[PDB]
Amino acid sequence: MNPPPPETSNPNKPKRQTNQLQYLLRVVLKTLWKHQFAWPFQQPVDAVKLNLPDYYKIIKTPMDMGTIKKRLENNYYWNAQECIQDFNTMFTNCYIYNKPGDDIVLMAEALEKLFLQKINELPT
Numbered sequence: 001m002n003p004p005p006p007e008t009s010n011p012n013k014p015k016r017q018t019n020q021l022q023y024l025l026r027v028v029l030k031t032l033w034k035h036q037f038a039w040p041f042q043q044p045v046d047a048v049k050l051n052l053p054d055y056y057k058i059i060k061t062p063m064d065m066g067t068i069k070k071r072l073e074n075n076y077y078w079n080a081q082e083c084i085q086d087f088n089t090m091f092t093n094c095y096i097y098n099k100p101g102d103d104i105v106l107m108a109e110a111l112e113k114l115f116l117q118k119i120n121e122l123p124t
C-alpha cells in the first residue's frame with residue numbers, strides 16, 4: 001500500500017515567484033527531466049507497482065521530480081532554497097534506500113552532479 005504522495009499545494013503556505021524559482025523550473029528541472037536516467041525519479045515511488053514493499057518502511061520523507069515540478073508550477077515554494085532542499089531529499093532518499101554502486105544509485109549520482117552544475121549559478 002502506497003502512502004499519499006507529497007502535497008503539491010497548501011492554502012496555509014504562502015506562495016512566491018522569484019527569478020531563481022522560475023529558473024529552477026524552466027532550466028534546471030526541465031533539463032534534468034530529459035536525462036536518460038531521469039525516468040525513475042519523475043513520479044513518486046510506487047512501492048506496489050515496483051514490488052518494493054519496504055520502501056516506505058524506510059523512507060519517511062519521500063520526494064520526486066514530478067512532485068517538485070508540480071510545486072514549481074503551483075508557486076508552492078517561498079524561495080529557491082526550499083526547492084533545492086526537495087531535490088536533495090530526493091537524491092538522499094535514493095542513497096539511503098539503496099547501496100553504493102547499485103544501478104539506481106548510479107542514476108541518482110549522475111543526476112545529482114548535473115543538478116549541482118546547473119544550480120552553481122542562479123539568476124539574480
Ligand SMILES: Nc1cc(-n2ccnc2)c2cc(O)cc(O)c2n1
Nearest residue numbers: 040041045050093094095097098104
Ligand atoms: N531499489 C530501487 C528501485 C527503484 N526502481 C525500480 C524500478 N524502477 C525504479 C527505485 C526507484 C526510485 O525512484 C527510487 C529508488 O530508491 C529506487 N530504488
